[PDB]
Amino acid sequence: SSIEFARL
Amino acid sequence: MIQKTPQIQVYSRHPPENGKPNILNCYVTQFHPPHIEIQMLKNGKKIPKVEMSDMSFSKDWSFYILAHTEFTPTETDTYACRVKHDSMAEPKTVYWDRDM
Amino acid sequence: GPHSLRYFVTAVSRPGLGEPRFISVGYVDNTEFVRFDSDAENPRYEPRARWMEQEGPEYWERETQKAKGNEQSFRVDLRTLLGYYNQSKGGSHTIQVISGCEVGSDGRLLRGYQQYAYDGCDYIALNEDLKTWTAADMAALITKHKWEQAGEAERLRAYLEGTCVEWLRRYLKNGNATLLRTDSPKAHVTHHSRPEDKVTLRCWALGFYPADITLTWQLNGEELIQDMELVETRPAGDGTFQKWASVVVPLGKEQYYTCHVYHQGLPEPLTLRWEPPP
């Protein structure tokens, strides 16, 4: 399962 | 921005034999940006039915994709793959060489 | 041996053409098993490998919403980067990410990844220690400082050592049989003319899987790695791969050369020579 990405 | 020039290979799925249906491939790799235009040509004229695989990218970030079409080679018919991409001024045409 | 679970994600802005094109691809041992492409009326994660259909409709609903969530974040990120780099809203830009983990044969984490790229150039990446960040330029430093303050590195380390590994184990045991698939190459040598008193011998390896393979030419037992041409390994389009290596030799000396094919599917390396049809 993928991870929820944080914002740049 | 930064751009990578596509590398191109044109070849058949099966050993080419005159008269026997086969599949011609145009493997395009190492390009960036992802937008790219690919056409396959028969004796200089665009081939209508050309399928495209989904696009993917590799560890170095460059994209790759495979275009293919059905075809029945003959001793005299010429095939090529033409690619248009922002990294190049003009479109690049690579001809199919039976021995490669 | 060592296995991996990685997601390759891409967001491409299309000013004046519509919303950004967002794509997320999941791999297990370099084999695509799931894909989400925003270019659909109702985009959702789809299985790309048979053994994945073993998951329940709950898994896909969850993964799909998570991808839709990342699509939004990337949409915002694209705008943010236009600011960081002082770029116009009329051009197309790309954000790419490789996120994942690699484990040993014992099932434990060997190394985790979390690297970004903007327009094909490294932007920011989490170091092997999984605690510090490497920024590629001034823009990336702004991101680095935000993530350092929010403890992003800690959040990823938890995902990498926990969730990522745990799911990889689950996947590996569900597709193990398929992932271990092996297709031996079939090889043969072709003969081609050359200007004057030379000829080309080309050694073909066809229908093999996985793509990893090595082809060599030897002259009386010694490997010839100098003037030997070879093409990058390429897909046949049916799941298997192709490759060839050639050498130019003197006319009449074809029997002094031998081709060698090394592939994990073979019981032992293949040895071939030019065979003039008797």
DSSP-derived secondary structure for C189-238: EEEEEETTTEEEEEEEEEEEBSS--EEEEEETTEE--SSEEEPPPEE-SS
Compute the nearest-CA separation of B74 from chain C (Å).
19
Return the ∠ at Cα C240 (arms to C239 and C241), rounded to 5°: 130
Contact between chain B and chain C (3 or more Cβ pairs less than 8 Å apart): yes
Residues C151 and C230 in one domain: no
Return the SS3 of B87.
coil
C176 contacts C54 by C-beta, under 8 angstroms: no
CB B61 to CB C25 under 8 A?
no
Q: What is the CATH number of the domain that holds C232?
A: 2.60.40.10
Q: Judging by DSSP bridges, how do beta strands B63-71 and B22-31 pair with one another? A: antiparallel
Distance CA C263, CA B98 (A): 25
The answer to whether residues C102 and C227 belong to one domain is no
Whether B57 and chain C come into contact, CB under 8 Å, resolves to yes
Same domain, C204 and C129: no
Q: How far is the C-alpha of C102 from the C-alpha of C207, rounded, in Å?
A: 28
Domain closes at, from C181, C215, C240 = C181
Residue B70 forms beta bridges with which residues?
Answer: B23
What's the CATH number where C7 sits?
A: 3.30.500.10
CATH architecture observed for domain B1-100:
Sandwich (2.60)
Count how many pairs of residues, chain A against chain C, have C-beta atoms within 8 Å: 48
Q: Find which of C36, C59, C73, C81 to mutate to test the A interface (most A CBs within 10 Å of its CB).
A: C73
∠ CA C37-C54-A6, nearest 5°, is 40
CB half-sphere exposure, B11, CA atoms < 13 A: 22
Do B9 and C231 count as a contact with CB atoms less than 8 A apart? yes
Residue that finishes a domain, picked among C181, C208, C225: C181
C77 and C211 co-located in one domain = no
Q: Are residues C235 and C107 in the same domain?
A: no
For chain B, the domains span 1-100
- Same domain, residue pair C36 and C162: yes
C270-276 long-range Cβ contacts below 8 angstroms, 24+ apart: C270/C185, C270/C187, C272/C187, C272/C188, C272/C189, C272/C203, C273/C189, C274/C189, C274/C191, C274/C201, C275/C188, C275/C189, C276/C191
Residue pair C133/C156 in contact (Cβ under 8 Å)? The answer is no
Do residues C247 and C228 make contact, with C-beta atoms less than 8 angstroms apart?
yes
Q: A2–C116: do the CB atoms touch at under 8 Å?
A: no
Residues C35 and C170 both lie in one domain: yes
Query: How big is chain C, counted in residues?
Result: 278
| Residue C113 shares a structural domain with residue C23 | yes
Q: Which amino acid is at C93?
A: H
Q: Are residues C93 and C228 in the same domain?
A: no
Q: Which range of residues forms the domain containing residue C15?
A: 1-181
User: Under 8 Å CB-to-CB from B34, ≥6 apart: which residues?
Assistant: B55, B57, B63, C10, C12, C94
Residue with tokens 């390396």: C269
Q: Note whether C touches A: 3 CB pairs or more under 8 A.
A: yes
Contacts of C97 in chain A (CB under 8 A): 5
Q: Are residues C215 and C175 in the same domain?
A: no
Asked which of C181, C210, C240 is the last residue of a domain, the reply is C181
Q: Which residues of C touch A7 (CB under 8 A)?
A: 73, 76-77, 80
Asked if residue C35 lies in contact with residue C26, where contact means CB atoms within 8 angstroms, the answer is yes
| Method of structure determination | X-ray
> C200 near C192, Cβ under 8 Å?
yes
Among residues C34, C37, C29, C65, which one has the least CA distance to residue C52? C34
H or E element that contains C144: helix C138-149
Same domain, C19 and C146: yes
Resolution at which this structure was determined, Å: 1.9
Strand C186-194 relative to strand C133-135, pairing? unpaired
Residues of A in contact with C123 (CB under 8 A): 8
Tell if the CB–CB gap between B27 and C10 is shorter than 8 Å: no
Binary contact (C202, B99; C-beta < 8 A): yes
If asked whether residues C41 and C103 sit together in one domain, one would say yes
Q: Which 1-8 residues of chain A touch chain C by CB within 8 A?
A: 1-8
Count of domains forming chain C: 2
Distance CA C263, CA C258 (A): 17
Contact (CB<8Å) B2/C119: yes
The rounded distance, in Å, linking the Cα atoms of C128 and C156 is 12
What separation in angstroms does the CA of B76 have from each of B16, B25, B98?
A: 13, 19, 11
